[PDB]
Write a protein that binds this ligand. Structure first.
Ligand code: NA
Ligand code: NA
Ligand code: NA
Ligand code: NA
Ligand code: NA
Ligand code: NA
Ligand code: NA
Lengths: 174, 174, 173, 174, 173, 174
């Protein structure tokens, strides 16, 4: 049965929105895993943990806003399993940052495919939603992760534990 | 003659902007009619009246912003008659909400056709104007009107006058 | 059936109130047209536009108050088409002021005929309503528009664009 | 290798903590599903949605605190898939409240089994952790959900939509 | 090699961003020239100078935002010579306003071509960037410059120095 | 014709002021290039970028003050092309600081030649203008750039990326 509010909202866009919801929830799960990995007593980088917890919360907000959009357009939310992250151990702050960069680029690629689908279906409201709330957020996150990776590599990470300690203090601390 | 400021502004877009101006003015007229229908002593739903007056003011602001855009791009405003609404009596709060939902969906359809036209003419400024100031406003208005219709139906409207009274108090009051 | 609140409210008064509502809505439409005429890039008199937008809001408030009165007395609102203004181009600030003076005098004439009808129907509440909320408002608007036309004419409008610019700055600003 | 901080922390307690983490994340997922079910335009009970979103946040805080405890005792976090909820459609406010009551009782049962395990392993710190941060939280949640279900049934839910509307307004609103 | 952050960013978009940076810097240079032209003792219209200095600052901020975007997407900034303006003497306030209108329309045309390129490359982030930070800014600047030119012409500029004096005082002040 | 305000303002001084205007604009351009070089994701030294942006603004203020002086004395501003900087890539923070030191010494040499010309033309107002607003600014900028180069060299730059990171944090940050 069609929703009383549905208008110019293709079924493919609805399915793709559900997939994007699942993907953003998965990204939040990955970031939560990273955060509490750096909370371990044998890693002990509290600011890495805080940074990744903040990224987890940001991805969760992305997912919730996608669910709200789904309801706004008359689509129907269908949730799926949130897969566990690929790693239980993230090795180092540099490796965690590189994995976060890869994850953000994958989420951005999915969002670009979603925008392409919305464009092909002539859905300007969905295109504008994606542009306003996701595309530049992903661009900024990717640029910041690239900066962090560059600085960590230049400081001597991951071989230099002093490098990761000082980066945790001076960049991710304040 | 051509305006000294006109640039990448097609004649068809100008005419469509004038048509949209007339349509938004008509929608404001319809909402004003509804509002003062609920002000009648034999209807007496003060919060319904306030809600529809607010919707009238919003539609009028849409029309004024369209006129400002027309002047910004070097087009020329051509006003037409504002036709009276199709009904003098709106029967009930639920029926008024359903008519408002239908009207907002018609205005949204006209806005989507206008955006398709702006896209065909390669007018990205007009596309951005429509996306930023109208499309999501329509989506939110339609979602809210659907919520109102749903609650009124589930409460027992329009047969239950108690339902419309309580909805006027608890939803449209605060 | 008759409204439970209707008392001493003649049918002719009700019809005339509906006509006056349509007229006030039309006057607001005309003022809106003028306002956005002076917003054009080839006219560009911001304060003329602001003045006429304010007049448009005043006329719309008059119409809403008439609708409220109609409901207060037990009458029934019947809306009609709001006709487009007679002009799309108002030529100049002086000509727009003269057209506004003419429009306000027509609205005042309609209001005086409505007061005459209310008097013939022995409806003192309606007479007092018109006196309190419309008649002096019209007298003041007409006096102000006459002052504006006089100043614009004496300054050299409409031939002198400098005159309309300075009037836009110093009077309407 | 064994953590430098591990002391009197049994492996079974560690595995059970991981299981409890997964269960609390699952409960948060269920509550989020419920919340955005009530955000649908054909349901439109915003206070039900807010209440269930708050319960989702509560379960997520429970999960994060369990992860922090795991790291505190020298255990190692191992995350698993977060299974999708059993329902996509929650039918009614009363049925959603009943499902939430069932869910809270299941989480409480798991917490009680975990406390029994901690008692058998002579881990008084874990017993105190569970008592202080979870058991009474569950008792309060279960009591409140029972109150809500009782009021909804006595008002005439789920047949009376007026009942769910008024309960959304007067109980979950203020 | 390709930046670790580069994603869906075409080489043509990068080159066009560099060209747009050069163009915005050039527009800032032209506005600075105009501003300090009106600072001359034989012109002496301080508010024209203030207006054009503000426009120079706006165009340079546009250029800095383009450079920030270039770095955000993984492109590489390549700066070029900033050509001197076509005029050292701008003759009058009206002629300066007309030249500014022409310049803003040229910048807007380049921005529209850049947006069309971004559309052809299916780069929605760049399209949104251009729409959000440039297109409406250009539309507003062009509308305002048109208003200024219209008022200056109607007041009697450029033959009437009194017109430019009064416009400097009452509009740009 | 001669300006009504011109007095004791030689033709050579006017031409030299125009040349100095071009040179200060060129220096601002060079500093802007450096600043946005350090904004690159593969360099990522935020405080170096801020420092060089500030130096760019300082040089632009110098140029604007020269233009104001030109108009004050009755001279006529003649602008020229602002040449692009000699480098697109500044290699390192230490090399950028050394290039900035070289640039500031070149600007100072031009200012000293300009003061020599003003002295030969018996223009005490121009001498005082140069002394008050430019010469000591150049001396202070050169001293500061020398301090920065010295510290960067002593810390181990440019081979040690940790050195440039820590200098960015502790010197250019506060
Ligand atoms: Na857009
Ligand atoms: Na992100
Ligand atoms: Na609307
Ligand atoms: Na009036
Ligand atoms: Na709970
Ligand atoms: Na501009
Ligand atoms: Na300097």
């Amino acid at each position: 049965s069609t929703s009383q509010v549905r208008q110019n909202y293709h079924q493919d866009s609805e399915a793709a929105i559900n997939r994007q919801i699942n993907l953003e929830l998965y990204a939040s799960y990955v970031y939560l895993s990273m955060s509490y990995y750096f909370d371990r007593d044998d890693v002990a980088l509290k600011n890495f943990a805080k940074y990744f917890l903040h990224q987890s919360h940001e991805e969760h907000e992305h997912a919730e806003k996608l669910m709200k959009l789904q309801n706004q357009r008359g689509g129907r939310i269908f949730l799926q399993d949130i897969k566990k992250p690929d790693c239980d151990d993230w090795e180092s702050g540099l490796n965690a940052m590189e994995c976060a960069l890869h994850l953000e680029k994958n989420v951005n690629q999915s969002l670009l495919e979603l925008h392409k689908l919305a464009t092909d279906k002539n859905d300007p409201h969905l295109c504008d939603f994606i542009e306003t709330h996701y595309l530049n957020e992903q661009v900024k996150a990717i640029k910041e992760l690239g900066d962090h990776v560059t600085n960590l590599r230049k400081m001597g990470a991951p071989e230099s534990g002093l490098a990761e300690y000082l980066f945790d203090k001076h960049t991710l601390g304040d």
